[PDB]
Amino acid sequence: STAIVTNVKHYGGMGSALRLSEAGHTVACHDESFKQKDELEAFAETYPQLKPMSEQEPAELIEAVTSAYGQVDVLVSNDIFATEWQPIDKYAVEDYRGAVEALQIRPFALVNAVASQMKKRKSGHIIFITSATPFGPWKELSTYTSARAGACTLANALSKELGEYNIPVFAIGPNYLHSEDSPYFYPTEPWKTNPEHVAHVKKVTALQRLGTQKELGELVAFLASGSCDYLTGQVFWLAGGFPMIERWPGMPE
Amino acid sequence: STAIVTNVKHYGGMGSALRLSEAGHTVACHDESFKQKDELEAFAETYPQLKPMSEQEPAELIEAVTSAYGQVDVLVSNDIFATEWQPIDKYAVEDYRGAVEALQIRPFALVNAVASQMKKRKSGHIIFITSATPFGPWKELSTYTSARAGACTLANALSKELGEYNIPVFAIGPNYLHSEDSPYFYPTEPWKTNPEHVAHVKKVTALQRLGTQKELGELVAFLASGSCDYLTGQVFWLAGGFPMIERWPGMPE
Amino acid sequence: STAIVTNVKHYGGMGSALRLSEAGHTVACHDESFKQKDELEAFAETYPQLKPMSEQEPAELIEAVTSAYGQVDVLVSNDIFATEWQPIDKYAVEDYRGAVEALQIRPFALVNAVASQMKKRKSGHIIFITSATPFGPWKELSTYTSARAGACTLANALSKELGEYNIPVFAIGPNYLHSEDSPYFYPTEPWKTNPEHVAHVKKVTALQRLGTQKELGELVAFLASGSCDYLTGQVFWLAGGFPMIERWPGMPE
Amino acid sequence: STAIVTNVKHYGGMGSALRLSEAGHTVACHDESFKQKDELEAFAETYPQLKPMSEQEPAELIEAVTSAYGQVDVLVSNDIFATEWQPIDKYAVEDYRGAVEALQIRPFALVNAVASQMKKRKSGHIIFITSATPFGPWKELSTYTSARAGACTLANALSKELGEYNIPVFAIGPNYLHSEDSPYFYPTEPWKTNPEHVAHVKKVTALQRLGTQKELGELVAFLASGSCDYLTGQVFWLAGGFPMIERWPGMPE
């Protein structure tokens, strides 16, 4: 079984790839840095169980992995975009354009490229990593939030046609996921260190902590494993019970 | 009070313009066909209560109406897109891109242009016309369905930031809205004539009929009146009880 | 046209009753205080446009209004229940039974009693005043919240069978609805007087204010008017943009 | 670790208890028929890894299992209720009362009895087996459908308070979950043996098949493993892509 995990250095990329590997998949990895030969080799050295690819664009990635490992069985579109808190009228229109390109068009493109080989053999697993922000939106994050919602509905809508070919489709929408060295979106600094940040996280989640790469990775492996295909179409909120809702005056923390 | 309704010939364009004009708003009306003087001036003869405009692109549209009528008080983004049932692997990536430009980036651009003046007055009403398809996705309509979902969350996210400036933001998402002579998306032929189309609507909606422009016009006017601003954030499902879910074997219609 | 509003003194009862009357409905009013001829006659004096009934049980409440005005056209089940913040293990099970009785059984019993005459003349309007609590749960309000959610879905489920009879069904879920002198659930005091409470409502809603009885009443009258039946099965969040979600450290409110 | 599965011969009970035992939980099993010596003993010789109990009532069961095996670590409220297709005016009000008792009060009562011990040690796992009918309600199932939706929100709200104490709370809403010999709610005969039923499941699910008990049991065992507590508060729609929303005339199945 061959897996593809994108932007592997960021977001839920590492927890996906490491736990898919441990579960017996062959895991090919995309990342923007893998354009530079040193960074692809530094990573392939540090994680010899992972197979970093240099391919950057969606279609060529699917063919590069289909060529080298025979097929693509599991697609994890781990999508990222660097956003900015802005009031609506401060955005430029191209700001929304890049957001939909990185969080909506990119996963659509990969499914577009991998679908026929999955449909023809009637086997496959597709997982979008989206965002839990559609579920409780902060103000002044209009582009990133609305785009992630288009990705959630894309996964849901795709499950409706892909089920007849036995291809389950999933959307994992995290929030407050510890991203370690990656800045998307909760690096150890400052979310694990700065006490104003650790106290924010204890307030806004139910579990009063960040989620872990292992947790995200366990979910990806479980859905990728074929053990529960009947969840096809599900949007998962991986946000530790976010959002916590502000209660009336006089109520304890 | 001055209103803007887009693509006024199609979807819920007529009901919005026709009913906002009765509630006393000045209704500027946009449409692709108003590019040609002949089409625009025919429309203003047929509809003396309405004010057609030649301007077609977002910033120009806000400018012209603000120039002619002093300000833009109500924004009805009546958004449309040429559809096409298709499996995921048969779209071109350009098919999604265009679907997102028309159904996400365009309402965004309009809000992006008009928000500062509304925010200046600390008043305004913004209504996206979207789609009930995200609430019950059909298979093989994944570009139009997911794009429309991004437009709903954009409305809801926007409401969080603009409420501070006393601007409600709403999304009306319709399905099975009788579009008279417009092919977007339920023209009289065949949807009121063909006995297979007629029995489809009876089966899949709870009220067993198409939706009227008057009903959408009434909803748009109600929201733009300032009588129920406290509904801000709402995605309305204007779909007669769609979807009707298929019951067990041997059960009546 | 003849309408019933329950618990008229509390929650969305006064706004419903008053605005329904201004639109020309005969408004018969149920309330627990109307058991004393005292309270009934004082209400009838203060509100001569409203018709307070003594009947308390749902079946005989429906029949008495039917016997006095011929038929019931609009049902507004304005349900309430006295609430207690509790950890789950500190409730008695009876606390939840009482909550379900007031918030699911009661509106069920009323529609159980009124639906035949509505179905028969193939006209009628049913509106539940539920709650916006299911949309963003506070911790330690599990009984009241899960109960209101049951009523939200009962409204949506009722719309599926009743549209065949041209009966639309609605749920309206308020949060931070100013209830004047009613303690259910946002009386003028403390919520418009104590500046800590004033700051809480400015923090948690997008419009930074309470809802008004009139806003709720305009929504009910609009729904009850037959102007927009295609919205059947809708759950309206009348919570002024609640919930606002607490943002990252260092970010303005 | 000790787990309790209720109504274990029915619905998602056999998959919950079989799969949880394979993961090395002690699975105490509650079921109605275990009031009979011969029923409980037969079950125990056929399933030597499961521990059937005779206790029926919620407080009695938790205490028995805490008595025999020290504590309750995992609770699976597999709640079941017989009902009929019927219009709203045909139910007695007692029919909804019973639905609420069997599908809402009982899960509540189990958590109310066990929450205190789980909170004391700040560890535990609570899973409700509810229903996916609230996601796509059929007409004329208002009592069951709405009760289930109240259990879903019970789970979600309970997660917001038990997160502090590190107790994740989940709901799992099946539909078209094949139930083998149990009549709740998709027994093998007729759903896999009759062609009229075989085609219905092919039409209304995206995967065109029923859900196996192993799939539910795998889900239950995953959430009870402590490998993904960050999912706490999730309602999972274990229904295989249900519902498949009927498409325009002339379009193929």
Calculate helix-pair angle for C106-121, D93-100, nearest 10 degrees: 140
- CA atoms of C201 and C207, how far apart (whole Å): 9
Domain boundaries, chain C: 2-238
Say how many residues make up chain D. Answer: 253
- CA atoms of D178 and D197, how far apart (whole Å): 12
Residue type, D4: I
| B154: nearest CA partner in chain A | A146
Residue type, C195: P
Sorted by sequence, the CB contacts under 8 Å of residue B3 that are 6+ apart come out as B17, B20, B25, B26, B27, B28, B72, B73, B74, B75, B76, B224
- CA atoms of C231 and B135, how far apart (whole Å): 13
Are C145 and D153 inside 8 Å of each other by CB?
Answer: yes
Are C197 and A138 inside 8 Å of each other by CB?
Answer: no
Residue type, D190: P
Are A163 and D211 inside 8 Å of each other by CB?
Answer: no
Q: Which top CATH class is D68-238? A: alpha beta
For A166, left (φ over 0), alpha (ψ -120 to 50), or beta? left
Alpha-carbon gap: B169 to the closest alpha carbon of chain A (Å):
12
Please name every residue paired with C174 in a beta bridge, in sequence order, or none if there are none.
Answer: C238
- CA atoms of B104 and B83, how far apart (whole Å): 15
Resolution of the experimental structure, in angstroms? 2.2
- CA atoms of A32 and A34, how far apart (whole Å): 5
Among candidates B229, B234, B241 on the partner chain, residue whose Cβ is nearest the Cβ of C215: B229
| B86: nearest CA partner in chain A | A161
Chains that touch D (3 or more CB pairs under 8 A): A, B, C
Check if the beta carbon of residue B231 is closer than 8 Å to that of residue C238: yes
Strands D169-174 and D125-129: parallel
- ω into A195 cis (within 30 of 0): no
Residue type, A34: F
In whole angstroms, how far apart are CA B79 and each of A91, A161, B21, B184? 21, 25, 20, 10
End-to-end CA distance of chain A: 47
- ω into A134 cis (within 30 of 0): no
Which stretch of DSSP H or E encloses residue C203?
helix C195-204
Q: How many CB atoms lie within 10 A of CB A215?
A: 23
- CA atoms of B208 and B239, how far apart (whole Å): 10
Residue written as tokens 């409420």? B163
- CA atoms of B20 and B6, how far apart (whole Å): 13
Cα angle D241, D246, D250; round to 5: 130
Are D150 and C104 inside 8 Å of each other by CB?
Answer: yes
| B90: nearest CA partner in chain A | A112
Beta-strand ranges (E) seen in B25-151 are 26-29, 51-52, 74-78, 125-129
Question: Which residues of C lie closer than 8 Å to B, measured between beta carbons?
Answer: 159-164, 166, 168, 205-208, 211-212, 214-216, 218-219, 222, 227-234, 236-241, 244-245
| C247: nearest CA partner in chain A | A138
**Chain C environment of D136 (Cβ under 8 Å):** none
**Chain D environment of A157 (Cβ under 8 Å):** none
**Chain B environment of C211 (Cβ under 8 Å):** 230
Q: Residue A169's Cα: distance from chain center in Å?
A: 13
Among candidates D138, D197, D206 on the partner chain, residue whose Cβ is nearest the Cβ of B249: D197
- CA atoms of C30 and C13, how far apart (whole Å): 9
End-to-end CA distance of chain D: 47
Are D241 and A229 inside 8 Å of each other by CB?
Answer: no
For C70, left (φ over 0), alpha (ψ -120 to 50), or beta? left
- CA atoms of A182 and D104, how far apart (whole Å): 43
Mutation to test the A interface, candidates D230, D244, D247, most A Cβ within 10 Å: D230
Q: Which technique was used to obtain these atomic coordinates?
A: X-ray
DSSP state of B243: P
Beta-strand ranges (E) seen in chain D are 2-5, 26-29, 50-52, 74-78, 125-129, 169-174, 235-238
Chains that touch C (3 or more CB pairs under 8 A): A, B, D
Tokens of A82: 């660097």
Burial, A122: exposed, middle or buried (Cβ in 10 Å; 0-12, 13-18, 19+)?
Answer: exposed
Work out whether the CA dihedral C80, C82, C85, C91 comes out positive or negative.
negative
Residue written as tokens 């007695």? D92
- CA atoms of C121 and C116, how far apart (whole Å): 9
Calculate helix-pair angle for B142-162, B93-100, nearest 10 degrees: 30
Which stretch of DSSP H or E encloses residue C29?
strand C26-29
In whole angstroms, how far apart are CA C35 and each of A54, C41, C56? 79, 11, 8
**Residue (of B143, B187, B149, B215) closest to B9 by Cα position:** B187
Among candidates D88, D104, D113 on the partner chain, residue whose Cβ is nearest the Cβ of C158: D88
**Chain D environment of C104 (Cβ under 8 Å):** 96, 100, 146-147, 150
Cα angle C131, C137, C141; round to 5: 80
Q: Phi first, then psi: what are they for A164, rounded to 5°?
A: -65, -15
Cα angle A222, A227, A231; round to 5: 80
**Chain C environment of D112 (Cβ under 8 Å):** 88-89, 91, 93, 96
**Residue (of A51, A21, A1) closest to A213 by Cα position:** A21
End-to-end CA distance of chain C: 46
- CA atoms of B74 and B16, how far apart (whole Å): 11
CATH superfamily of C2-238: NAD(P)-binding Rossmann-like Domain (3.40.50.720)
Which stretch of DSSP H or E encloses residue C127?
strand C125-129
End-to-end CA distance of chain B: 47
Q: Phi first, then psi: what are they for D50, rounded to 5°?
A: -95, 150
Chains that touch B (3 or more CB pairs under 8 A): A, C, D
Are A151 and B147 inside 8 Å of each other by CB?
Answer: no
Residue written as tokens 């697609």? A75
- CA atoms of D201 and D199, how far apart (whole Å): 5
- CA atoms of A184 and B193, how far apart (whole Å): 54
Alpha-carbon gap: A197 to the closest alpha carbon of chain C (Å):
6
Tokens of B170: 């709403």
